[PDB]
Amino acid sequence: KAKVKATLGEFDLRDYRNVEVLKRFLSETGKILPRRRTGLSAKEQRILAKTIKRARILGLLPFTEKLVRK
Amino acid sequence: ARRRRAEVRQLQPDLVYGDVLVTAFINKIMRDGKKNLAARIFYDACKIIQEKTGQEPLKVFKQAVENVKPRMEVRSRRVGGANYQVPMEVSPRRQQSLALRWLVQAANQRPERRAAVRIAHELMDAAEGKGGAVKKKEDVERMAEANRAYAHYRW
Amino acid sequence: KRQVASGRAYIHASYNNTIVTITDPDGNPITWSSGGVIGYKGSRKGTPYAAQLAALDAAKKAMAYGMQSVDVIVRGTGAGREQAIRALQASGLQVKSIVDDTPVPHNGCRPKKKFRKAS
RNA sequence: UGAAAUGCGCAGAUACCGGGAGGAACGCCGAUGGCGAAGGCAGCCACCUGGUCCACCCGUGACGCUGAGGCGCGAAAGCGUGGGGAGCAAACCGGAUUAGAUACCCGGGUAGUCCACGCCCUAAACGAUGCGCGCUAGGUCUCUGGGUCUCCUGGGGGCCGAAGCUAACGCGUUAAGCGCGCCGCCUGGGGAGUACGGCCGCAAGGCUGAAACUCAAAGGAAUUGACGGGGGCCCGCACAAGCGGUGGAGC
RNA sequence: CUUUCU
Ligand SMILES: NC[C@@H]1O[C@H](O[C@H]2[C@@H](O)[C@H](O[C@@H]3[C@@H](O)[C@H](N)C[C@H](N)[C@H]3O[C@H]3O[C@H](CO)[C@@H](O)[C@H](O)[C@H]3N)O[C@@H]2CO)[C@H](N)[C@@H](O)[C@@H]1O
Ligand SMILES: [Mg+2]
Ligand SMILES: [Mg+2]
Ligand SMILES: [Mg+2]
Ligand SMILES: [Mg+2]
Ligand SMILES: [Mg+2]
Ligand SMILES: [Mg+2]
Ligand SMILES: [Mg+2]
Ligand SMILES: [Mg+2]
Ligand SMILES: [Mg+2]
Ligand SMILES: [Mg+2]
Ligand SMILES: [Mg+2]
Ligand SMILES: [Mg+2]
Ligand SMILES: [Mg+2]
Ligand SMILES: [Mg+2]
Numbered sequence A: 001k002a003k004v005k006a007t008l009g010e011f012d013l014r015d016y017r018n019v020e021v022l023k024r025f026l027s028e029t030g031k032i033l034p035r036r037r038t039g040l041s042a043k044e045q046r047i048l049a050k051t052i053k054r055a056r057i058l059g060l061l062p063f064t065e066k067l068v069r070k
Numbered sequence B: 001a002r003r004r005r006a007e008v009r010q011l012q013p014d015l016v017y018g019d020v021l022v023t024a025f026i027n028k029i030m031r032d033g034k035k036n037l038a039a040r041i042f043y044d045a046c047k048i049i050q051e052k053t054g055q056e057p058l059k060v061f062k063q064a065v066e067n068v069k070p071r072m073e074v075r076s077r078r079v080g081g082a083n084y085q086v087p088m089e090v091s092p093r094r095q096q097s098l099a100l101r102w103l104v105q106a107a108n109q110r111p112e113r114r115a116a117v118r119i120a121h122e123l124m125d126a127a128e129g130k131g132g133a134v135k136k137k138e139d140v141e142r143m144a145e146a147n148r149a150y151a152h153y154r155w
Numbered sequence C: 001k002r003q004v005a006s007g008r009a010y011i012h013a014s015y016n017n018t019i020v021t022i023t024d025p026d027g028n029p030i031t032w033s034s035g036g037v038i039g040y041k042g043s044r045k046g047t048p049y050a051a052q053l054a055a056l057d058a059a060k061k062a063m064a065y066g067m068q069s070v071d072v073i074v075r076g077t078g079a080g081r082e083q084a085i086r087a088l089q090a091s092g093l094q095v096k097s098i099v100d101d102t103p104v105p106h107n108g109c110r111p112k113k114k115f116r117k118a119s
Numbered sequence D: 001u002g003a004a005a006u007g008c009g010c011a012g013a014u015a016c017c018g019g020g021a022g023g024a025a026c027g028c029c030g031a032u033g034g035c036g037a038a039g040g041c042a043g044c045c046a047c048c049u050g051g052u053c054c055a056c057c058c059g060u061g062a063c064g065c066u067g068a069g070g071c072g073c074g075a076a077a078g079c080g081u082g083g084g085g086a087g088c089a090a091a092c093c094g095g096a097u098u099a100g101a102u103a104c105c106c107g108g109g110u111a112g113u114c115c116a117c118g119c120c121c122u123a124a125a126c127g128a129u130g131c132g133c134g135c136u137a138g139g140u141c142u143c144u145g146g147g148u149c150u151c152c153u154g155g156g157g158g159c160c161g162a163a164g165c166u167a168a169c170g171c172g173u174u175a176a177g178c179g180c181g182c183c184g185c186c187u188g189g190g191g192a193g194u195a196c197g198g199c200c201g202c203a204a205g206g207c208u209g210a211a212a213c214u215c216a217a218a219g220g221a222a223u224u225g226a227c228g229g230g231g232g233c234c235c236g237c238a239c240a241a242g243c244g245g246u247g248g249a250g251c
Numbered sequence E: 001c002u003u004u005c006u
């Protein structure tokens, strides 16, 4: 569909507290989205996943969700 | 029928009531190419419908057939190990053929000594819903549906 | 027995059986069915038709507790699954939501030989 | 499970919710990606630590390459001592299947798989390709630096391909091309990685490694077929759908 | 399905 990167302005993707931003990079099942979807550079996507994994331990982001209407 | 889908052999309308479905029946009655004797029989039988009811023969026969048509049948089926009886819907053609096939086999199972009679009574009984044809049929519709677990092939 | 008007339908589709269990909205089970509880035994419990019948049976037993609607929750992939769902929907019983909640390791325990194959 | 049975379940199993214990492994990200000399390395955090790339062109001044032996590292399995043990699981105990089934399938299940310390030192330890250096068209995709950031310039990973090489398959600036240096190795097949001896090892075993006898081959790549319980496309009264038969009786 | 041998 349309890339998640393209729907945002600047943002520090080292920022493991900005759950508002971070959360659009997760799927409806709280799974880290692949680059095909996130629209990221390899290097960026590496840094992302790292800080997504931080948010998660902080309690700020989900490790999982359940799929609604299936 | 590897290549094409086979032309449904299209049938001479009836000499008497002007209906295609009747020749079809007369044909299933017919042995060894003797369409004459076959046709006597079916007509003789239609006369026995008259004398034994105020009904017009044609619409007895029509409505008998309609009562012998199966809705579902069980065609056998390989599953890389076992052959299962698989329930599935029945082509309008096949409805019609199986009907007339069973009408005549049912007819010829009967006790009455003369063919025109057996044809006649079986027809009567069938429009009513209680010929030997209809048992050889609710038997089918039963067996399909009593195998309804395997309706998830259909092939 | 108690009157609960809505609660959960928990479907457990597996390649060997669908088991449908119905609960109050806190998760305590009211009734339950399975391919075995219906007539079936052995390989036939797996069928989608088995699924329908269990879904329908367990939904009937649940309407005996005056159940009106359910949150559906599915787990496992299995022949009977969308069939078990389709049953509930068309059972009188009203289906508010449907939710896949199939449990999955964040790779953890070694599978049995049969389920390693992806090795 | 093909179908089952063994098995578990009214001491209440399965499915469902809540709480707790433990063991082991980290899903998405994840790649045709990255790192390491190899083996090999994957949740997150901190500490300790090895390598390596780019820019400046500041320093030393041939200080270099290779490397018998030595020394160290070295997947899994295996061993010792002591922990630990959730799941999986050689052996083993059962159920199926089968002509039989010491297997393939199902149910149990010990060693082991896990940790620490000490052994073992092997491999399809593979790129089946020793290390270093220079030289010889390009194109394309990718990871990671720098620039005047359309494009240029390093380092790394792929694909196609100049010249060229190759038995062919293929290689082709990441050479299997053209050259130099230094090391390791080969010398028909079987006997045989056997015997003997030595060294090492707790053991299991490992390294080194023959001969007699015996064969006229053993091999590699590619060609045409043929075949497949490989693939794709398609036919035929081939099967299906039908109607009549044979197999029964007399002749 | 099933197929040990030839
Ligand atoms: N994950 C921990 C790390 O693992 C390494 O080793 C340690 C651990 O991994 C290892 O296992 C620990 C153990 O500590 C402890 N006594 C028992 C505990 N269950 C284990 O836990 C750990 O390892 C197991 C392996 O799956 C898992 O629990 C889990 O992956 C991890 N939490 O034991 C080692 C020390 O006891 C490194 N030594 C260190 O970086 C750190 O402990
Ligand atoms: Mg079953
Ligand atoms: Mg629990
Ligand atoms: Mg490797
Ligand atoms: Mg200088
Ligand atoms: Mg000077
Ligand atoms: Mg080792
Ligand atoms: Mg080991
Ligand atoms: Mg040990
Ligand atoms: Mg056995
Ligand atoms: Mg087993
Ligand atoms: Mg087990
Ligand atoms: Mg290569
Ligand atoms: Mg390059
Ligand atoms: Mg090439």
Ligand SMILES: [Mg+2]
Residues within 6 Å of the ligand: none
């Ligand atoms: Mg020799």
Ligand SMILES: [Mg+2]
Residues within 6 Å of the ligand: none
């Ligand atoms: Mg060859």
Ligand SMILES: [Mg+2]
Residues within 6 Å of the ligand: none
């Ligand atoms: Mg050939």
Ligand SMILES: [Mg+2]
Residues within 6 Å of the ligand: none
């Ligand atoms: Mg036929």
Ligand SMILES: [Mg+2]
Residues within 6 Å of the ligand: none
């Ligand atoms: Mg004969």
Ligand SMILES: [Mg+2]
Residues within 6 Å of the ligand: E005
């Ligand atoms: Mg033999």
